[PDB]
Design a protein around this ligand. Structure first.
Ligand SMILES: COc1c(C)cnc(CSc2nc3ccc4ncsc4c3[nH]2)c1C
Ligand SMILES: [Mg+2]
Ligand SMILES: [Zn+2]
Length: 313
């Protein structure tokens, strides 16, 4: 009960900054997550015995893929940690509990393949879940792990609070489907500008949490340039493998997934920052002003990709 996690001084300080990288020491990632749960939520939110057993079952159910791996899970949870800490009063106790767990679980059992590849392959999961195929799977895997003996970290919630938290997690994980992000941000953009946005309206909160989930999921673009650049190698390693598998089905992949079009990556990154990233962190910064450091970091990284094209790197 009086057992805190503590981190080395550099980590204790840098973990509070949006641009923190969790490092290459896999064995420290669980403690980093527990540390974030303790400061964000409380040392009492979860029985440490059950939390530790939950964390290790979730870790085991991530696969050895270049990008959608256990490192990504903890990275996305840290970005959520930094949002929640810079917005102390805006979130309920149930939301702070649910959203870190949601982030840890959001890509459970990812195979390194998009919803599109599953549908064109005719993968069984595409028959079970017609839209947001992998994301419904991710939530399914979350429920399964919560129902293992000794793994139910929510056991001390009332029946209504248990139902509310699972519904927060479900919406949070579904929202990480990028196909849904575009319309969600447009709606939030309209609501903010016409002044109709109301954080006591549950359907409005849901939308805001959706956008926080996209922001954390894409947080690779908000790190320092060398982290952003080296993460992009992992992202394209998965995409180019999918492109190879499209060619095996006799389908030309989109250029993003065709390794024969490596040369156009810098131009592709520009489209992506302008169409997805910058819009995401701009609407988020309008709704939650203390998340501005994410928008600033994203714009710095857009400038670095502009420099790559102009042959300065
Ligand atoms: C996971 O989201 C991402 C992150 C964080 C960073 N980068 C990307 C890739 S964006 C991207 N869009 C395009 C369009 C054409 C194209 N031709 C050759 S590479 C390439 C692209 N890369 C994604 C999808
Ligand atoms: Mg995902
Ligand atoms: Zn993800």
């Amino acid at each position: 009960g009086l057992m805190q996690f503590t981190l080395p001084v550099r980590l204790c300080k840098e973990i509070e900054l949006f641009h923190f990288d969790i490092g290459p020491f896999e064995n420290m990632w669980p403690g980093i997550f527990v540390y974030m749960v303790h400061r964000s939520c409380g040392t009492s939110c979860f029985e440490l015995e059950k939390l530790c057993r939950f964390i290790m079952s979730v870790k085991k159910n991530y696969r050895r893929v270049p990008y959608h791996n256990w490192k990504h899970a903890v990275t996305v949870a840290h970005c959520m940690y930094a949002i929640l800490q810079n917005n102390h009063t805006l979130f309920t106790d149930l939301e702070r509990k649910g959203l870190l767990i949601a982030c840890l679980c959001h890509d459970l059992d990812h195979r390194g393949f998009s919803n599109s590849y599953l549908q064109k392959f005719d993968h069984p999961l595409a028959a079970l879940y017609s839209t947001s195929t992998m994301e419904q799977h991710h939530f399914s895997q979350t429920v399964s792990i919560l129902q293992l003996e000794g793994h139910n970290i929510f056991s001390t919630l009332s029946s209504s609070e248990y139902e509310q938290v699972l519904e927060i997690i479900r919406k949070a994980i579904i929202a990480t489907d990028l196909a849904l992000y575009f319309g969600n941000r447009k709606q939030l953009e309209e609501m903010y500008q016409t002044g109709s946005l109301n954080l006591n309206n549950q359907s409005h909160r849901d939308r805001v949490i959706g956008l926080m989930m996209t922001a954390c999921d894409l947080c690779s673009v908000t790190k320092l340039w060398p982290v952003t650049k080296l993460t992009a190698n992992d992202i394209y390693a998965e995409f180019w493998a999918e492109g190879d598998e499209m060619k095996k089905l006799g389908i030309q992949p989109i250029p993003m997934m065709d390794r024969d079009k490596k040369d156009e990556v810098p131009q592709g990154q520009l489209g992506f920052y302008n169409a997805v990233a910058i819009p995401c962190y701009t609407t988020l910064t309008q709704i939650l002003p203390p998340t501005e450091p994410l928008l600033k970091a994203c714009r710095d990284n857009l400038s670095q990709w502009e420099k790559v094209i102009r042959g300065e790197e």
